[PDB]
Design a protein around this nucleic acid. Structure first.
Ligand code: CS
Ligand code: MG
Length: 407
DNA sequence: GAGCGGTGGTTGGT
DNA sequence: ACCCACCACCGCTCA
């Protein structure tokens, strides 16, 4: 669920992470904060094959991507109300990211962080998060189009734009379409009533009128239900396309308790949100010797090769992350810039081509582990890094480069 | 989760 | 007793 929702609210805007991240960093003068439901991995991560722990491995590579976007993730886990939590939590930590346990459903807790200002956006499996208070929700972190390769884009959904848009659906309206047409907890709903007639009741306000009703008031329900049931068997207001005389409404319906599960979901306590306001983001500091230990054991990246490869794979990410904390000791991170580009894979975010020493940047020496065309972690390597990030961490190397081009 | 073609049911009109 | 378009529901397919 919700089956067929995107025909009503639109498919979302397909934008890249880079652009969302650098735009935010430009307007708000600090990195984008993202609550990531941990359910997105389950059925996207188990397609890698070979080696040791391919599921954990793609998680590893996506975390290195999150570093290179300069994004501050908080990773959210379902509570009591394939990829292993323990592992995963340990790797979230080695990367200097944050792991958060929801009291109840992760989707609900995410939306709640966003609406409390702990994060600026939710990245989820779908837009269920909108029924839960979400305003800016992402889905489908994935390669762009048929270009089969790097996962660079997400699909962005904007609750305020949807509610104003052709479908008019808002949080209270969708919730009504979930009750009748089916959701996670009540996959049935009103039998025989699907998305098209449910969206027609939502734009007739029936979703507002019910989310405003307490469950105690029993008198108010019947007036609402009898009213709704009457427009259904008659279509007196023209609320719908046709008339549904045989569309049976169950006695239980509406199930307020299931309704309340959306309108007042089990989310963290106020004290938890307070703790979060002060502890997130934390000191984003990647544990280098920790990742080394992890990768040797988890991925069988053993001895010098493994060390080399961990250096190559993590150095561009560590450069971005170092830039956003930070005579000319800018050189400790960047040796030079060679070129500029506004590539479509970032919706044309300006990038500069930075030269750097991988092994020096990471801090590992491969000669201190056993030795058993090639990549030399002491030669310069070259990454494309967003300009806006370079001007914050290495301002004078950008200026020098900028003067070189004028000349 | 989401798309897609099929199937069977409801409505309004032939 | 038929069509007709629309819809809702099913089963499969890809992750
Ligand atoms: Cs239904
Ligand atoms: Mg869901």
């Amino acid at each position: 669920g919700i089956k067929g929702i995107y025909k009503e609210i639109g498919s979302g805007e397909r934008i890249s992470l880079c652009k969302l991240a650098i735009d935010h960093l430009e307007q708000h003068n600090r990195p984008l904060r993202l609550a990531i439901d941990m359910a997105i991995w389950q059925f996207q991560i188990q397609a890698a094959r070979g080696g040791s722990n391919p599921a954990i491995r793609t998680l590893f590579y996506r975390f290195v991507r999150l570093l290179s976007l300069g994004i501050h993730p908080i990773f959210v886990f379902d509570g009591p109300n394939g990829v292993s939590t323990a592992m995963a939590k340990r790797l979230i930590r080695l990367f200097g990211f944050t792991a958060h346990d929801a009291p109840g459903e992760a989707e609900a807790e995410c939306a709640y962080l966003e609406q409390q200002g702990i994060v600026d956006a939710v990245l989820s499996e779908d837009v269920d998060t909108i029924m839960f208070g979400s305003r800016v929700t992402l889905r489908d972190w994935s390669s762009e189009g048929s270009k089969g390769g790097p996962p660079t884009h997400v699909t962005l959904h904007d609750a305020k734009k949807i509610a104003e848009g052709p479908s008019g659906l808002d949080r209270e309206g969708m919730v009504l379409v979930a009750l009748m047409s089916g959701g996670d907890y009540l996959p049935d709903g009103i039998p025989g009533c699907g998305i098209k007639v449910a969206c027609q009741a939502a734009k007739a306000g029936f979703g507002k009128e019910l989310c405003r009703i307490k469950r105690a008031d029993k008198e108010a329900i019947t007036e609402w239900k009898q009213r709704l049931l009457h427009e259904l068997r008659t279509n007196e207001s023209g609320f719908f396309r046709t008339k549904h005389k045989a569309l049976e409404i169950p006695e239980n319906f509406p199930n307020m308790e299931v309704l309340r599960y959306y309108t007042h979901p089990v989310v963290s306590s106020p004290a938890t949100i307070e703790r979060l306001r002060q502890e997130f983001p934390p000191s984003s500091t990647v544990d280098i010797a920790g990742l080394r230990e992890f990768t040797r054991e988890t991925f069988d990246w053993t001895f010098r090769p493994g060390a080399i490869k961990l250096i190559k794979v993590l150095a561009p990410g560590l450069l971005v992350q170092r830039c956003l904390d930070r005579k000319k000791e800018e050189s400790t991170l960047v040796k030079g810039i060679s070129m500029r580009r506004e590539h479509f894979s970032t919706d044309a975010t300006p990038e500069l081509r930075v030269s750097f020493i991988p092994a020096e940047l990471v801090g590992l020496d491969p000669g201190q582990e056993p030795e058993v065309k090639p990549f030399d972690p002491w030669q310069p390597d070259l990454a494309w890094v967003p300009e806006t990030i370079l001007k914050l961490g290495v301002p004078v190397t950008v200026e020098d480069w900028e003067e070189g081009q004028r000349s």
